[model samples]
Target: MEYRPLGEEIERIRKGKNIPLRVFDENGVSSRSYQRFVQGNSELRISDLAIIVEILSISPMEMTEKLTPMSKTVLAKEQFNQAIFSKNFQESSRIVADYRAYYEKSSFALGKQEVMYSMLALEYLFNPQTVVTKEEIIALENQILERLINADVYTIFNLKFLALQKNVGLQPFPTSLLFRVLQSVNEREIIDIRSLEIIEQVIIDFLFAAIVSQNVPHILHVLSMFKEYEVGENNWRMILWKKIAEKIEMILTNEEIFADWSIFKEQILLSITLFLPKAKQEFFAGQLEKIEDSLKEIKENG
Candidate 1:
């Protein structure tokens, strides 16, 4: 099977039916998903394939294709994962043409494109060399703290809570705090930058989705899982756990700022959550609060 060659044919089908790429992704698909397709370990779920096929008005005659495996087994997945995991964001408006180039009825987009970042993330996560040692974290913290001593309050605050990077979102808050607040976890987990990359990608995929597509049945469905994971098996209640969930759900349904990415996010969030049972919602919620508050604070402060 000339797998990578199908990019042209998928483009044909997509154009023939006049279906926009965005329609296929009215709810965004996962970056990991296209990787799965490329790795030959997975296939698009029937429901999603159906949406795409429906949008393109095509039959499933040549539904399957195999990757040529561009590199060693380790390298391909490494590339594949990073492409899915890293900052390769493309807005829906922008991808219409590029997707035509990238998609082949055969070679999936993210999988084929994941050549660089996947390798980097893989080196960081799986390669023994990048493993975090106690000394590494201490040294990293010390270096950051030295920079922060002269830095403003917000920068120091960011270093404390966001691991010295600019605040991307709330997902990093706990892991950052976990290192600061729980010394044992930092030394024990040894979750390196690559491992951190893997995780950060997963969290952003899920949170971005729930907040975007406000489909009630599934939003509640997924949030139930998130809540269970976040609060724990016994469902511990913080003073305002319910309120935090309520707020998050509210942001999901009501917020206008997130509207642009909603549809593309819908699928990515659902699939990732389906795979991972634990998302630690209340703790995660604690993180989302900073983002939500910062949005408000930006307006109020300015």
Candidate 2:
């Protein structure tokens, strides 16, 4: 068997999963040997090929099979987009089914998961009966969040989540996921750009869930982290954030607990004081204080 094609397939799977060679480092193989295998410098034994396929989360057959239909895919994607844009959603879905079939056996680099995510988003948006329950969405979110370290994949995952939120009602919010997004934001400097609308909306949606459940700590937890990150970045994106914060306050004021919003306000300030570092505590402390005063003012004026 020609080793070049199999090596290319293995390399694509590793890249697709975004795992580093360090994964193989910790595994049974030396990094150099793994690199040689991936570069087609050495032939793969049956046992070694089995090991590699397991690492890639693919079958041995997937590694060896040759499948490509880019010509068909280009035309199918255009047809699908046109049908969907013109509100022929059923036809669009049919086109995707065809796309899926054509590419089912193709290489992982050929937009395998990307194509599936499109189908998922389409189904979640147009099919009113399509609903991703809390458990399922949470599981899926954790799976992707574990793999993704930058803002691009973060945006895509949340876009799918947004579609599910609008079509279904996935109400539970994961605080850990919020924390992970914060880490990604800090790592990727996501706030320097305005391209991450889905991530912004997902954070807002978490706040909405907290408000819906009337969970004071959840609200405070989210706001504290959000405010701390903003302060840490020297109040980056405040112009864009002002609208979201105002909308959150609007919802709170109309609800029953707006009467005791001050009580919840203290919880947020207390957490920030205790948890934030010296500089952050100094800045976010002042900012949260002003936010409290504003909320109180909103309560009194209205």
Candidate topping lDDT: 2
- Give the poorly placed runs of model 2, Cα more than 4 Å off: 1-82, 109-111, 127-175, 191-194, 229-302
Per-residue lDDT tens digits for candidate 1, residues 268-294, read 344445434465634454455454543
Q: Which pairs of residues collide in candidate 2?
A: none
Q: What's the true lDDT of residue 302 in model 2?
A: 50
Task: Give me the candidate number with maximum TM-score.
Answer: 2
Tens digit per residue, CA lDDT, model 2, 1-302: 23555567778888999978887766675667767866646654567656666777886434323333234554576676677678777777677666656666776542445444455555555645444344544454455444553444354344444344345444444456556655555455454223355555566556555544445556667765555544334444443354446545554446545535455555555766565688976775565455555555545655
Instruction: List clash counts for every candidate, in order.
Output: 13, 0
Q: In model 1, which runs have C-alpha deviations exceeding 4 angstroms? A: 1-117, 130-280
Model 2 TM-score, all chains together = 0.42
Worst 10 residues of 2 by lDDT: 61-70
For model 1, what is the alpha-carbon lDDT of residue 240?
36
Per-candidate alpha-carbon RMSD to the true structure: 19.8, 14.2
